Design a protein around this ligand. Structure first.
Ligand SMILES: *[C@@H]1O[C@H](CO)[C@@H](O)[C@H](O)[C@H]1NC(C)=O
Ligand SMILES: [Cu+2]
Length: 227
């Protein structure tokens, strides 16, 4: 359980969607982060993979604001303290807004995977995962925006999948957090995109899995990494 509290881009903080404050406020502030109804700080499990909730989390609506990023620039997402127990991958996708991200229909967004990190080491099952990397970096993740993509407005869908309960059907816990970016530079790729509702299925090999046993491999869920 947790959420993204802050985003660091080009030397300033863009405050996150503080899901334990703003839902209680009813004139809440404008941010680059999508609003959600996930006030339990919880997840979308396999029962929700083909619902709109998977796209940018439960009840999500676009952020009003969009943050410019320098070409090949970093976006650092700062989480609330991630529990060691919640082992699993950290996955990052972009979808083009083809206009202002604040007015997009999230159900039409087509995501391409720009980064994925999975099982890092399995010397002591359940092992060391991308989520443990995030903990070791004091609960932050650095995303580098590719220089080879067509610049424009994009949703960054940033996600931890916790697998501590994933040996049961619909046990995997997805924690998607969306923010609005203005990608800048000279690139031209328009990578093939996947609907939010086709990212994951509740029987995928990296989703329905027992992490407590020795693992010979881990198949990071979602569509193929764009390079
Ligand atoms: C996180 O930062 C705090 C100090 O602000 C420190 O006490 C903790 O050990 C840090 N680093 C790691 C690897 O957790
Ligand atoms: Cu949790």
């Amino acid at each position: 359980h947790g959420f993204v509290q802050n985003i660091v881009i080009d030397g300033k903080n863009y405050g996150g969607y503080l899901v334990n404050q703003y839902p209680y406020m009813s004139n809440p502030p404008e941010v680059i982060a999508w609003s959600t109804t996930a006030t339990d700080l919880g997840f979308v499990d396999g029962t929700g993979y083909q619902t709109p909730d998977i796209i940018c989390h439960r009840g999500a609506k676009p952020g009003a604001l969009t943050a410019p990023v320098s070409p090949g620039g970093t976006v650092e997402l700062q989480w609330t303290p991630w529990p060691d127990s919640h082992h699993g991958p950290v996955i990052n996708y972009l979808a083009p807004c083809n206009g202002d991200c604040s007015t997009v229909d999230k159900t039409q967004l087509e995501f391409f995977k720009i980064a994925e990190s999975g099982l890092i080491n399995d010397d002591n099952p359940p092992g060391i995962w991308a989520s443990d990397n995030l903990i070791a970096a004091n609960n932050s993740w650095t995303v580098t925006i590719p220089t080879t993509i067509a610049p424009g407005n994009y949703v960054l869908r940033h996600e931890i999948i916790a697998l501590h309960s994933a040996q049961n059907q619909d046990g995997a816990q997805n924690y998607p957090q969306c923010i609005n970016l203005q990608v800048t530079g000279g690139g031209s790729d328009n990578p093939a995109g996947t609907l939010g509702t086709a990212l994951y299925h509740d029987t995928d090999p990296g989703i329905l899995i027992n992490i407590y046993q020795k693992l010979s491999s881990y198949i990071i869920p979602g569509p193929p990494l764009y390079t």
